[PDB]
Design a protein around this ligand. Structure first.
Ligand SMILES: Cc1cn([C@H]2C[C@H](O)[C@@H](COP(=O)(O)OP(=O)(O)O[C@@H]3C[C@](C)(N)C(=O)[C@@H](C)O3)O2)c(=O)[nH]c1=O
Ligand SMILES: Nc1ncnc2c1ncn2[C@@H]1O[C@H](CSCC[C@H](N)C(=O)O)[C@@H](O)[C@H]1O
Ligand SMILES: [Zn+2]
Length: 404
C-alpha cells in the first residue's frame, strides 16, 4: 500500500475486517446486499501518516443521500459559531474578505459568515445537506473541493483569506489534490485551517470506532507538519478541541509567511516523548482494541442472559465499526435511537439493528443504553435525565467498557 501523502510504504497495525459503508441506512424491506471493503489501518514509513489501506470511492460515501446533519448537535452549533466569529475578528478583517469552507454540510459554520455579510463559498458535494445550507442563504457549490474546482473558484472569485475544513480533510485520500487546490486558491497571506479527530486521543482512549470508511487519515501534529512541509506550507498553529472524542485544529500558512506558535513545537515534543506514532504504540492500541471488543461482547451477552434489555443511542457512522467488528446485532441491542429523520425507520449497516426516533426512547425505558454517540455524552445525557432517574443506565466502551 503506498502512502497517499508521500508515496512511502504503509505498514498495517490493525485489521477491522470486512465493513459496510458506515453511512448507508437501508429500509427494512431492502435486499440485504451491501458494498463491503476491508477496513485496516497502517502508518507510512516515511512521513508517519496513519491512514487506511483501502479507499472507498468518494461517490459511494458522499452523494445525494449522505445522511449526516451537522446541526443536529447544540454543542457543535455553538462550537462552529464561535469559530466563525473568531475568523471574522482576525483573518477576515480586510476589505472584501473571502472564506471557502470544504465540507460545509448544512451550513453549521457558514451561516455565521453569511449573517456577517462576508463573501463566502461552501463546497458540499452531498446535495441533500447542501440544500439545507442554501436554504439559510449560504452560497454553496455541490462539488468536491480538489485541484480543478479550486482552480475554477480562484479564476472567478479570486483568492480566499481563509480556507476551512472541519471533519472533512481526514475523509479525503486525495489530500495532495486538495493541497494543490489550497495552493491555487489561498491568498499569499491566508491560512488553511482544518480540524479532525486526533491520533493522540484515539490512542489514549482506544476509540477505534473513529476508524471507518469516511476516516481515511488519523492526523497527528507530526504527520500534518510533514504533509504541510512537503507541499510548501507550514504548520503554524495547533489547538486541541474536545469535540468528536478529541481533535486538533491545525493552521497551515505558506512556508515562512508566519512564525509558528509555541504550541506547535510543544505538541510535537509531547508526541515524540510519548512515542505516539511509533509502530509499537500503534500495535499496543490494536491490542487494546481487541480487549474492548471482548469485554463489550462479554457484557452484552451477560446482560441478555440476565434478562436485561439493551438498546443503543446514536446511529453514528462510528457505530458501524463497533457492531461489525464486534458482531453485535439486534439479538443483543434491539434498537438504536437517533434524531436524524432520514436514519429513522431504517436498519444500521452490516448489523441491521432497527433505528427509531429518539422521541421513542421514553417510559417504559430499557434497562441499558449502549452509547454510540459517546462524543455527545454531555449533551445527550442532559436531555435524557428521566431515563437515568428511572434506573436506566448507560453502557460506554470509551475509554473502557463500563456502565454508569
Ligand atoms: C447530539 C445528538 C446526536 N444524536 C444522533 C445524531 C447523529 O446521528 C448521531 C451523532 O453522530 P456524530 O457522533 O455527531 O457523528 P458520526 O459518528 O455519525 O460521524 C458523522 C460522519 C462523518 C462525517 N464521517 C464525521 O466525521 C462526523 C462529523 O459525522 O447521534 C442524537 O440522536 N441525539 C443527540 O442529542
Ligand atoms: N472533497 C470534498 N470537498 C468538500 N466537501 C467534501 C469532500 N469530500 C467530502 N465532503 C463533505 O464533507 C462533509 C463531512 S461531514 C462534516 C461537516 C461539517 N464541516 C462538520 O464538521 O460537522 C460531508 O458533508 C461530505 O459531503
Ligand atoms: Zn507518507
Amino acid at each position: 500500500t503506498a502512502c497517499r501523502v508521500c508515496g512511502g510504504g504503509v505498514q498495517e497495525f490493525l485489521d477491522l475486517g470486512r465493513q459496510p459503508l458506515s453511512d448507508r441506512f437501508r429500509k427494512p424491506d431492502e435486499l440485504d446486499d451491501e458494498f463491503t471493503y476491508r477496513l485496516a489501518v497502517g502508518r507510512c514509513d516515511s512521513c508517519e501518516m496513519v491512514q487506511l489501506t483501502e479507499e472507498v470511492p468518494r461517490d459511494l460515501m458522499f452523494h445525494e443521500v449522505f445522511p449526516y446533519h451537522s446541526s443536529g448537535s447544540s454543542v457543535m452549533r455553538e462550537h462552529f459559531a464561535m469559530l466563525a466569529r473568531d475568523f471574522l475578528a482576525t483573518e477576515l478583517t480586510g476589505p472584501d474578505p473571502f472564506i471557502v469552507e470544504i465540507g460545509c454540510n448544512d451550513g453549521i459554520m457558514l451561516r455565521t459568515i453569511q449573517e456577517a455579510g462576508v463573501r463566502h463559498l461552501g463546497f458540499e458535494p452531498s446535495s441533500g445537506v447542501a440544500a439545507k445550507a442554501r436554504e439559510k442563504g449560504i452560497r454553496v457549490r455541490t462539488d468536491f473541493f480538489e485541484k480543478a474546482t479550486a482552480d475554477d473558484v480562484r479564476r472567478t472569485e479570486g483568492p480566499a483569506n481563509v480556507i476551512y475544513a472541519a471533519n472533512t480533510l481526514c475523509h479525503i485520500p486525495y489530500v495532495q489534490s486538495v493541497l494543490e487546490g489550497v495552493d491555487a486558491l489561498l491568498a499569499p497571506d491566508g491560512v488553511f485551517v482544518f480540524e479532525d479527530p486526533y491520533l493522540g486521543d484515539i490512542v489514549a482512549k482506544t476509540s477505534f470506532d473513529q476508524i471507518y470508511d469516511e476516516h481515511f487519515f488519523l492526523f497527528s501534529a507530526t504527520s500534518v507538519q510533514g504533509m504541510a512541509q512537503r507541499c510548501g506550507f507550514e504548520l503554524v498553529d495547533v489547538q486541541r478541541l474536545p469535540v468528536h472524542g478529541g481533535e486538533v485544529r491545525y493552521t497551515l500558512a505558506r512556508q515562512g509567511s508566519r512564525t509558528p506558535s509555541a504550541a506547535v513545537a510543544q505538541l510535537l515534543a509531547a508526541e515524540r516523548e510519548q512515542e505516539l506514532s511509533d509502530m509499537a504504540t500503534l500495535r499496543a492500541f490494536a491490542g487494546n482494541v481487541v480487549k474492548i471488543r471482548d469485554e463489550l461482547t462479554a457484557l452484552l451477552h451477560r446482560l441478555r442472559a440476565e434478562g436485561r434489555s439493551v438498546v443503543g443511542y446514536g446511529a453514528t457512522a462510528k457505530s458501524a465499526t463497533v457492531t461489525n467488528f464486534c458482531g453485535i446485532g439486534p439479538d443483543l441491542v434491539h434498537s438504536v435511537y437517533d434524531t436524524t429523520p432520514d436514519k429513522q425507520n431504517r436498519l444500521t449497516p452490516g448489523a441491521h439493528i432497527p433505528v427509531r426516533p429518539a422521541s421513542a426512547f421514553s417510559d417504559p425505558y430499557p434497562d441499558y443504553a449502549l452509547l454510540f454517540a459517546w462524543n455527545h455524552a454531555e449533551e445527550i445525557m442532559a436531555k435524557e435525565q428521566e431515563f437515568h432517574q428511572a434506573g436506566g443506565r448507560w453502557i460506554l466502551y470509551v475509554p473502557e467498557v463500563h456502565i454508569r
